[PDB]
């Protein structure tokens, strides 16, 4: 029954006004651009004009933006109708930006909660959706009834910046997956080998592999990087012949010599004999 | 009851020697450098003084040396003794360096199995460790019992460069999610937050991902790279925020540049609403 209000409608905010309204709630959408709420408006949103309008019609304020510059500029204006409204900023951005927004909304009398997308418009609402949110458990609290209408809604603690952390760091973890089974692929593809053949086996081995990372974490936590099987100064020496041998094929080696790399650094570091827990610390720049 | 040979004594070959005795197989050993196998000896092995006489020792003969020049060039010197023997490549190695090996094995009289171990030393011999094999199946029936002693023995087929190919195209895609883990940890790291926490979110995200795999390899056989759910051009624009969320952190981005330079490729091929199933073209240095 919360009135709730989305300002952004590309295909997130689409997806997002959509499963709002679907739910039943009284949605009040905008857009720097018109013409975008056309089916909103017959499945039973209201369009505003401004996104002062926009957010007056709304105890809960979606903010779906391109990125966080055009979400400072848009609120700016929206600042003296604030108060008293919860701001969810659903708009991809970094930790630091989402702790800043956070600081800008309390000083104008508004609640905040930040929100990592996990799910593609397209899953918008649909059971399996996960968006993860950060920042005062009791705004989480009374907002869940409505998050729970783009799908799942998990919250990670108050943190402003935990819900983008999360999210990036997960996305990380993906590119990392993909762009090595990609590679694979391209090394079965130059042989004349089916990837679908292929798929089930990568399967079974990244499964097993993920059974390696709480001892991974455990020895980041602990600083004590004991090799639990491989040692990095192993891994590094059979390196080399998986970049010969993607070489053989025709396949470029891109993708895999910054790991490459970073295991020849723990190496060089003295390092041959920890496992990968060790490599963790390489990456910073401080 | 099947006599075996193991050339070469390093951490791999000294566990794969035994797993050989302890499953009951008469055992004869040999390195270019001695005392390696004084455990091997108690448990019952034999050492022999040239590599010439360990082969002469054993129908199936295990190779497991440093690489394949090591394994060009001891075998080379046993060349007038390999007739009628079956000759197994546990050397790490390339699949064009297994077709020459079994190119010059076949001429000199001798049946030839590749395999690709997959397993570390310490698993040699228990219940998970896995060896993939390739070559004659009939090759591979008549030695399956003898190369159980290791661990599982899965064969791939005839291709002699098969099980290598496998082998690191698994190592491939071990390597990417391990190093996109390991970026996503330092991330979470940075910010204070455990790792030990982190994993149960990051392999409940990564299981999830792995069920994308299969609809990945259909477009790469097919040719239609339909975006399944997102297209590479929106995943190319969400990249920006990950690279300054890890800059923030201090937290290097170089595990992560060879995949944002990937989708901005493929953006500008004019792909960008394609799914990620045509990042594998993009690999090709032909």
Redesign the interface.
Same mark, same amino acid.
């Given at each position: 029954r919360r009135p709730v209000t989305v300002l952004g409608l590309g295909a997130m905010g689409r997806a997002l006004a959509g499963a709002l309204v679907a739910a039943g709630h009284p949605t009040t959408v905008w857009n720097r651009t018109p013409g975008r709420a056309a089916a909103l408006t017959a499945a039973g949103a209201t369009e505003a004009g401004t996104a002062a309008e926009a957010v007056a019609a709304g105890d809960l304020v979606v903010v779906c933006l391109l990125?966080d510059e055009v979400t400072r500029q848009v609120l700016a204006l929206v600042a003296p109708v604030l108060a008293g409204r919860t701001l969810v900023n659903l708009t991809?951005?970094?930790?630091?930006q989402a702790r800043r927004l956070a600081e800008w909304a309390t000083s104008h009398g508004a609640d905040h909660l930040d929100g990592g997308i996990?799910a593609?418009p397209?899953?918008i609402g649909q059971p399996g959706a996960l968006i993860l949110y950060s920042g005062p458990e009791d705004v989480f609290r009374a907002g869940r009834e409505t998050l729970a209408a783009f799908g799942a809604a998990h919250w990670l603690g108050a943190?402003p910046?935990?819900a983008?952390? =999360?999210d990036?760091?997960?996305?990380?973890?993906?590119?990392?997956? @993909?762009?090595?089974?990609? =590679?694979?692929?391209?090394?079965?593809?130059?042989?004349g080998?089916?990837?679908?053949g @292929?798929?089930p086996?990568?399967?079974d081995?990244?499964?097993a592999?993920?059974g390696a990372?709480?001892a991974?974490?455990?020895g980041?936590?602990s600083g004590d990087h004991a090799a639990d099987?491989?040692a990095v100064g192993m891994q590094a020496a059979? @390196?080399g012949?998986?970049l010969?041998?993607?070489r053989?094929g025709?396949?470029?080696t891109?993708?895999?010599?910054?790991?490459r790399?970073?295991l020849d650094d723990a190496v060089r570091a003295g390092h041959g004999a920890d496992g990968?827990s060790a490599?963790?610390d390489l990456?910073?720049?401080?």
């Open positions: 990125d991809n951005g970094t930790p630091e996990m593609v397209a899953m943190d910046g935990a983008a952390l =999360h990036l760091a997960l996305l990380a973890a993906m590119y990392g997956m @993909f762009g090595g089974y990609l =590679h694979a692929v391209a090394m079965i593809r130059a042989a080998v089916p990837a679908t @292929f798929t086996l990568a399967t081995w990244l499964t592999m993920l990372l709480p991974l974490a455990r980041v936590d099987g491989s059979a @390196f012949n998986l010969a041998a993607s053989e025709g396949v470029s891109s993708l895999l010599e910054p790991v790399r970073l990968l490599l963790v990456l910073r720049q401080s």
